[PDB]
């Protein structure tokens, strides 16, 4: 079977006014062979700002995390940056 890894990504908005529901909808709309979106939640990071923490399960041989991050960041209207908060073997 294909080797897989669980990845938890932090997706940050531009301010305390960024529409977070649109932000996560746009992330989850991204399609990649070997990529499966998982659970997500919004976490307060201070001063009213909230970051999106979303898990995904990827097939090691098919999904480039660099490419995935770059794709998410194309949504400049909502996303300021992304970071890998955690990675775990499945």
């Amino acid at each position: 079977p294909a080797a897989k890894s669980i990845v938890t990504l932090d997706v940050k908005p531009w301010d305390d006014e960024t529409n977070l529901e649109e932000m996560v909808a746009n992330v989850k709309a991204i399609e990649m062979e070997g990529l499966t979106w998982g659970a997500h939640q919004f976490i307060p990071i201070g001063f009213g700002i909230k970051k999106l923490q979303i898990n995904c399960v990827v097939e090691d041989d098919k999904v480039s995390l660099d490419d995935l991050q770059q794709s998410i960041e194309e949504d400049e209207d909502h996303v300021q940056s992304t970071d890998i908060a955690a990675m775990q073997a499945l």
Binding site: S5, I45, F47, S81, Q88
Partner: protein, 437 residues
């Protein structure tokens, strides 16, 4: 309890994930509700009796479907520690994360399969396992524990265990670890042998041992070997260093940078400087989560409000520190010991790939290949090598293409280790030795 980070490494057939799952599960690290529903199901299948491994298989399936909630990090408490464990993924992009990631391990646990075929397959020179061990060693993870798994597959034979210990000792010695300071624990992750309770399947087993600077430490189980990890020291005494991840403009508040305190402490009222921006201001307030902190310590990801600064004057990659206590600065260049990983090709002076250091992402030129060295001792073997190839350790002079703030690894670890990206992977790992500020 004190906190420590552990990274579990091993071949795909080592059973390291089953072993890791068992520890978290039986050390109360798994969510109560989760365990209940999966144990209830595990019981229903038969007359009632169930193996812990079956419960873990069901959890693995839920995790695989992307249903399990919250961050992908295991945590559990031992008698002495609060442990965060990273079961190392096989994904090639994990390499960069291991290097620049936030959770640096205090100890690595190498899980090895005892079976004849599986054992050899795991200690291959070009295997991902050796690469992870080499990376751990290079990044300063000096404590190591070896667990020889699947002992049941070899009928808990003493000779086989002894031969595995001998070959594995050679394996880790070549990486750089001193086998005498490493406990070798025979276990069966699946069955629980020597995990939390001592095994009853090996009369010849008297326990593991390891030499420390004060004496010899002994124990029987893997849990005891983890509890025996020597207390690591934190950088709370050093000057502040807080790499910026993001910067926000909040109406009525002002500019709000956000990042992780790597070293030192940040407090409201403190005067700070942002390098290489060159901006100095007072910290109005500090917040983390839903609370207004009195101080941010190493490990805390915080957002803080500063005045008289536009969200455009500071940005991701910049480093915040104390204005008067060894304030951070940009560099003209920096020298680093570089370990070239397995990648096709040769590196020559002029090479200018992108480097990831803390939150900085900047192309830096391998300005000069100063020396090629013996990796483990650091001894200079040649002056100005003409090129570097996979496996080489060398001292390289780097010149960043854009203003960049870095530190010597011996002074500020989090700002002194970096990953070199190219050819769709990390081609090298670096440890900064000096900086020309």
């Amino acid at each position: 309890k004190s906190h420590i980070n552990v990274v579990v490494i091993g071949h795909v057939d080592s059973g390291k994930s089953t072993t890791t799952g068992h520890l978290i599960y039986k050390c109360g690290g798994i969510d109560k509700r989760t365990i209940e529903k999966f144990e209830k199901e595990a019981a229903e299948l038969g007359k009632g009796s169930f193996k812990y491994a079956w419960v873990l298989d069901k959890l693995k399936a839920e995790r695989e479907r992307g249903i399990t909630i919250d961050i992908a990090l295991w945590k559990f408490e031992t008698p002495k520690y609060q442990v965060t464990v990273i079961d190392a993924p096989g994904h090639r992009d994990f390499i960069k994360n291991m290097i620049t990631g936030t959770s640096q391990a205090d100890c690595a646990i190498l899980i090895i399969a005892g079976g004849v075929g599986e054992f050899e397959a795991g200690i291959s020179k070009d295997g991902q396992t050796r690469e992870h061990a080499l990376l751990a060693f290079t990044l300063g993870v000096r404590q190591l524990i070896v667990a020889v798994n699947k002992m049941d597959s070899v009928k808990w034979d003493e000779s086989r265990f002894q031969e595995i210990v001998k070959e594995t000792s050679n394996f880790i010695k070549k990486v750089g670890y001193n086998p005498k300071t490493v406990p070798f624990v025979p276990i069966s992750g699946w069955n629980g042998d020597n995990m939390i309770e001592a095994t009853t399947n090996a009369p010849w087993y008297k326990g593991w041992e390891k030499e420390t600077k004060a004496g010899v430490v002994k124990g029987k189980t893997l849990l005891e070997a983890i509890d025996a990890i020597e207390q690591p020291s934190r950088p709370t005494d050093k000057p502040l260093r807080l790499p910026l991840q993001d910067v926000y403009k909040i109406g009525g508040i002002g500019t709000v940078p956000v990042g992780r305190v790597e070293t030192g402490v940040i407090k409201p009222g403190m005067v700070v400087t942002f390098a290489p921006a060159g901006v100095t201001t007072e910290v109005k307030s500090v917040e983390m989560h839903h609370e207004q902190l009195e101080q941010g310590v190493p490990g805390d990801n915080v957002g803080f409000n500063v005045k008289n600064v536009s969200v455009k004057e500071i940005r991701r990659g910049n480093v915040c520190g104390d204005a008067k206590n060894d304030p951070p600065k940009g560099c003209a260049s920096f020298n680093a010991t570089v370990i070239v990983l397995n990648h096709p090709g040769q590196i020559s002076a002029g090479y200018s790939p992108v480097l990831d250091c803390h939150t900085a992402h900047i192309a830096c030129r391998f300005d000069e290949l100063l020396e090629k060295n013996d990796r483990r001792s650091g001894k200079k073997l040649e002056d100005h090598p003409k090129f570097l190839k996979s496996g080489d350790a060398a001292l390289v002079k780097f010149v960043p293409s854009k203003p960049m703030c870095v530190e010597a690894f011996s002074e500020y670890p989090p700002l002194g280790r970096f990953a070199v990206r190219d050819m769709r992977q990390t081609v090298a790992v670096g440890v900064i030795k000096s900086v020309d500020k």
